[PDB]
């Protein structure tokens, strides 16, 4: 069969993945979308603020960077939505279905924008 | 000796001798008649 | 000669495994199974890379595409002088048998075969492309 | 003169060009000894430079505003004003040699086609035959024309392979 | 100076014409592929047999001629 | 316990010119003679492919052994010519008197068709072509002081060349070693470690201690070369040597009584560069080769041959067996004693990597007198030995794939290191694929980021020292550690090994020989370009080796061979799947990567190291513009290629005008190659059909049928012309530049 | 699926069948040649277009011809 390897087949690694929102079955797709969106949204603000074109402005740097992070989350939400449209047109997990993914994309937008907003509040 | 003279008759050997001769003739002509541009 | 029936419980060669094996296609579209009898345990080369030991008696392998099965068949037949046969297996559980289609390898002429895609003319006697134009689809003069 | 050109012997720019080249050589000369090996070589170069500029002027070439010789290619203008040696005469000089080489090679290729194994006579040259054909090629223009008139120069259209059409 | 450049331009026109004209006159077939017409204007090749047939279609003659056109222009 | 012994066969082959008159005799296919022009190319392509002429390993080994004598004989003719031309057509004797003002020259051209202008004014009342091979510096270091000494070496070189050709004939036609002789790997290593490298190092130490050191000590003191004692007078008269080095007054007793400290005067550990000549101390170099001699002589007694003591290489390999690697190194010994290609793959890899290491160490630690201040020699030697190393490494990939196709046998390799590597090749190539994409974005993307920011008038947004910074902190730490090594970690060394680490510059004849090299943001960016282009070259070559036998596209690629064009247009198209084509593609990337390496070296040295020393300070050739300009692609185009190519394009009418011609000619050959790379033989075979028709019409059609080159030969012809044109273009550009200003 | 055609110049050498790496071709009885057999192409849906069969045909011009056509998972030679 496939080449067995500790990275591919280990107990500690398997348990960690099984607890991630993507692999945690039994949770509504919308809730998983919010949980995933919040994590990525919070991180997405970092690089924009520190290395953006308005990074050296004292107070505008925080606003401009976070506002650009919010924009990228919006674009990503569109990518999630159209992916579901193309992939699911006609199985065990509800997420991998036309109904499930549409809820998942909506949750990501809500969670992602909340994470970006929450990141801004931490700064000020 | 027949085979050796046959080897000298191979295409690469003939070309080397022929162009060595041809080049030498042209080089020698330009040594005694330097800078020919017009028949005159 | 009758169409053989595949035995899914046939033992497989001694192979550690590799990254050149089946992919998600096998679980969704199809895969191929090759089986043969081995006179003695011997080392052969896997078309997917590496070396495997064939058990004495029946052996069974699964491959991702037909060409891989027929590549192993050429090795076993030409070098080790065996006589393998392989199938096409679908995810629904159906099994299709081929090579040898009628039990005799195609290189050897056998009565009962019906000629297919045989044109009783030369290549130089085909019509010009203009005469097969607007036939509903791109058609070569050889097709008609 | 022709096309607005002037004889190099009467060209101001042509004369100035010679001084520039000699001046460059003289500048390098004064860093050596009188009769050292480098000095002798440089003096030899200067002699050839002076001879070259005298020969081109003596040849009656035409120089442009650049002060460099220009050649006349029209046969009518060349023969009219005595420039036949620039292009016109060398034209028939080259063709004789070019036809000589081509005619000799064609004779050899025909000669070995009759042999049992023509291919082995091409990688391994038949030197005695090649030398024989090399000397007889001096009269190629006469032999070439006679083949044309007798109709043995060209193959028949029916003996040449061609693709479907 | 204009003499040399003009003759280079002639080389470009004649060579580009050579490639394009060969691509058209040999489009219907050749000794290496007598029945090229049965494959169409644009196909990859006829395989490595018969010595190799890379860039044998009439489409490929045009493809090679574009390089010479850019060089000429 | 097969004894190690000499084993030969008497008169294996007859010496006759019969086969010289039968081209293709070596191969069954070509022995029948030509029918098409393809036969001619096949004759030269397969001439040295011994492994395919015969299946007998013994016959293959005997041809390899004698073909190596021919290579040695050719090098001796080449070496003899270099020494001879130094004696008869050089200004070496004048150079010894005034090394800092006279340009080395050892080639003179005849006065024909006006080419005598290439005999430039080089100094010493001599006219000739300036050489960048560094032979004058090498001869001075060894102690050569007259053209007679150069002349005698050339005559000795020809005698050695004759001996090498006799040996090749003797050991093939008269006494050919048997296969069992060639397979004494333990014996060969013992002799090559202690005998070739070991005694060779000791013998050269003898020359340096007795000839080079005394002669160069007086030359540096200013003694006229003609008034220096001859090397044999130094050898016969211990009194003379005692004056230069008092340690010689005690003879060899200190060596045998272990009072080795007595020899401290000529066996030194100074480090650094000799201030007078700008090169390494020869006393340091003598102690180096004495130490190296002992290390290798000890190394040559490790393997067991005939007397029990020693190691068995097979036993070492089979003992190194771990939990993660299955069987382990089992089966490698049989692979490496029965496959010449496997041996060649390893040796080319390390021999090429060694040549690249030589380039870095020789510039940073100039080992010859007056080598450093001769910027033309420094640039040429570094660039020459980088190119040699690059080609050898690509060959290592080529002959690793040949082994994989021809000499690989699965039965001998089951669950060993070699087998397990093949079984996760997708994991290796997929990961190496991602690393290359990552390195391409984060190294070349930075240049694109800087170019766009600069064009937009946003210099503060660029990656640079005056902007967002990328400091090679790790490299800077190592530079400082080596600079302080003599204080604590190498107490008995007086100076640091190189002046690149830090300290003060050494100037010879008003020019900088070596000074500290600073690493900044530009150096950070260029280094990660090197890592990118090297990793890609590994990907192409390693992919070819791992997929030589089969892949998910061609499951039976081994049966097709090592060198085939494709498997047809099926499966979407299979052009260039053979392992030979991975060498063909790998050559382009090796050329791409080494071109940046030699551009990096050339610009960094001129900008930051090379220059003229004056009262105020050091003024560099390009005035320190590397730091601010080399962070954009536009900077390289304008400041490096456009500005420095001024010398080559203005060379007409001078002694350097030859480089101008080759600069254009190289550009031509390179562009000419794209005809073969961008086209296919299908077009050309049809073109020849119309051309053949014209010859048939005139009864002048050849008997050997014209054929367009094969698919593979088109790719081989393309890459060879591409490399020659590209490399020759840089060669002309470098020499015309550095000779003119350096 | 590609198109594979056998023409009446076949001499029944069987080389095309041996060369094919996907068992697309086979030999059938015939009366039009000395060998009394002709090549057949009953399984063109498995053809990949390698044209190894054309490389192996001795007749001039070829007696087996492959016309690349519509692509699919099988004809594109994919294992994924
Ligand atoms: C189209 C190509 C071409 C042409 C037409 C010429 C023509 C000429 N070149 Mg040039 N040249 C070319 C390409 C060409 N070159 C190239 C590619 C290079 C680079 C390698 C050079 C490099 C070059 C140099 C370095 C020199 C020339 C010179 C010459 C002259 C030689 C005259 C001679 O040898 O008479 C000799 C007389 C003969 C009759 C020769 C033929 C002998 C046979 C046996 C006669 C048989 C008769 C029946 C002539 C004007 C020379 C010169 O002075 O030019 C002004 C000169 O020094 N050429
Ligand atoms: C490649 C083509 C070509 C071209 C464009 C020219 C061009 C020219 N030629 Mg030349 N010529 C050529 C080839 C060419 N020639 C050839 C192959 C030969 C034979 C070897 C000649 C022989 C020749 C002679 C004998 C004369 C010219 C002359 C001329 C000039 C005016 C007449 C003419 O030819 O008109 C245009 C050209 C053509 C239509 C092509 C055929 C030209 C024929 C062969 C010559 C015509 C001469 C003309 C009747 C002279 C009348 C007196 C004139 C002062 C008006 C003109 C510069 C005349 C001249 O020197 O004028 C100053 C002149 O006397 N040519
Ligand atoms: C370093 C260069 C080198 C060396 C050492 C060899 C060595 C060899 N070549 Mg090779 N060869 C080379 C370069 C080289 N070749 C190149 C560049 C080409 C062109 C592509 C060829 C083309 C070639 C062919 C076509 C053949 C060889 C053959 C040989 C073998 C016999 C030669 C012999 O008897 O010489 C004897 C040498 C002398 C007596 C020296 C004096 C006479 C010479 C001509 C000066 C030998 C293994 C022959 C063979 O049998 O190969 C298996 C053979 O047929 N070579
Ligand atoms: C790597 C080997 C090598 C190379 C590339 C050269 C290259 C050269 N040599 Mg040198 N030479 C060499 C080895 C070499 N030599 C050796 C080993 C010897 C000792 C016998 C000599 C002895 C020698 C002499 C005596 C002369 C040269 C000369 C020459 C030049 C003209 C050669 C020529 O056209 O002859 C003519 C061509 C044919 C006969 C064919 C040329 C730069 C000549 C030179 O530089 O003159 C100024 C010259 O006089 N060489
Ligand atoms: C005059 C002496 C002599 C003679 C008559 C022979 C005769 C023979 N040898 Mg022997 N041989 C000799 C000397 C001789 N050898 C020497 C000196 C060596 C040591 C290198 C060898 C090594 C040797 C080997 C290893 C083999 C032979 C073989 C042969 C046979 C065929 C050789 C052939 O086709 O050569 C024709 C080849 C050439 C003329 C090429 C010459 C190559 C040399 C090395 C010059 C290289 C120049 C180099 C490329 C220069 C750069 C080029 C660049 C400027 C373009 C034949 C029985 C072969 C055999 O028996 O096969 C069954 C065989 O495998 N010989
Ligand atoms: C391989 C390298 C090498 C060689 C060949 C030499 C050689 C020499 N060294 Mg040097 N040396 C070396 C490395 C070397 N050294 C190193 C690495 C060091 C650093 C430790 C030194 C340090 C050193 C010192 C300090 C001294 C020498 C000295 C000498 C000389 C005399 C040695 C002596 O007393 O020998 C004693 C005896 C022998 C070596 C045996 C000789 C055997 C002969 C050749 C046998 C001949 C037999 C034959 C059949 C007879 C001819 C018959 C025929 C005519 C018919 C000698 C020229 C001494 C000298 O004079 O310096 C100027 C000296 O003082 N060396
Ligand atoms: C120690 C070095 C070494 C040795 C001994 C060999 C030996 C061999 N190699 Mg390997 N190889 C090496 C290094 C080496 N290689 C390197 C560094 C590379 C990377 C470029 C390769 C890449 C390589 C490939 C890709 C192949 C081989 C092959 C072979 C085999 C046949 C070679 C042959 O017939 O050549 C005959 C020689 C020629 C046709 C002459 C080539 C001339 C070149 C292209 C000229 C380039 C320009 C020139 C140097 C300078 C300008 C010239 C001027 C006239 C303009 C043979 C076992 C072939 C094989 O089948 O192996 C099993 C094969 O396919 N090698
Ligand atoms: C300048 C010419 C050029 C370029 C840019 C590339 C680029 C590449 N080659 Mg190629 N290659 C070239 C010439 C070139 N090659 C030539 C002439 C040959 C023939 C010898 C090859 C042969 C060859 C081989 C055989 C291989 C490559 C590989 C690669 C890849 C290296 C790793 C990577 O992904 O880097 C990152 C990509 C880049 C640096 C490209 C430029 C990226 C820009 C600067 C930033 C991105 C733009 C941004 C998103 C904005 C877009 C806006 C727009 C959408 C509106 C990459 C795609 C290797 C590969 O695939 O490795 C995985 C590989 O195996 N090349
Ligand atoms: C580093 C990894 C060392 C790994 C190391 O030392 O492993 C050690 C381990 C050796 O295990 P064994 O003790 O069983 O080996 C016995 C040996 O004698 C060999 O038979 O090797 C492997 O498991 C092989 C596969 C490693 C796979 C490594 C994957 C990651 C590669 C990363 C490459 C980075 C390159 C950076 C260059 C500067
Ligand atoms: C492997 C071993 C190879 C060894 C090769 C040895 C070659 C030696 C050649 C030189 C011969 O000379 C070597 O011995 C001479 C005789 O003792 C020494 O001669 C020295 O001592 C003599 C003692 O009477 C004096 O007369 C000499 O004037 C004095 O120079 C040389 O200083 C030494 O260099
Ligand atoms: C130009 C070209 C050709 C045509 C090139 C050919 C046929 C090579 C020509 C070599 C020489 C010029 C011909 C043979 C010369 C003889 C040795 C005779 C010479 C006699 C004297 C003049 C020396 C291909 O065959 C080809 C094949 C595959 C991909 C690209 C190309 C490609 O680009």
Residue numbers in the entry:
A (entry chain L2): 53 to 142, 157 to 190
B (entry chain J2): 1 to 40
C (entry chain D2): 53 to 196
D (entry chain F2): 63 to 227
E (entry chain B2): 516 to 588
F (entry chain A2): 10 to 751
G (entry chain C2): 2 to 81
Task: Quote the passages of the study that discuss this structure, keeping the authors' original sentences.
Photosystem I (PSI) enables photo-electron transfer and regulates photosynthesis in the bioenergetic membranes of cyanobacteria and chloroplasts. Being a multi-subunit complex, its macromolecular organization affects the dynamics of photosynthetic membranes. A chloroplast photosystem I (PSI) of green algae consists of a core complex and three antenna modules: inner belt, outer belt and Lhca2-Lhca9 heterodimer, which together comprise 24 subunits.
